[PDB]
């Protein structure tokens, strides 16, 4: 529930842990 992954998910991928694709970024917990 926090977009503190520091990655964008416009491509539909996230390398960060527990991070979920939340266009255009990634959100973990």
| Domain range annotation of the chain | 1-29
Instruction: Please provide the distance, in angstroms rounded to a whole number, between the alpha carbons at the two ends of the chain.
Output: 4
Residue 9, token pair as written in the block: 């998910």
Give the C-alpha separation, 15 to 19, whole Å: 8
Phi, psi of 23 (to 5 degrees): -35, 130
Max Cα separation, the chain? 20
Residue 12, token pair as written in the block: 């539909």
3-state secondary structure of 25: strand
**Secondary structure element (H or E) that encloses residue 22, with its range:** strand 19-22
């Amino acid at each position: 529930g926090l977009p503190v992954c520091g990655e964008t998910c416009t491509l539909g991928t996230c390398y960060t842990q527990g991070c979920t694709c939340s266009w255009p970024i990634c959100k973990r917990n």
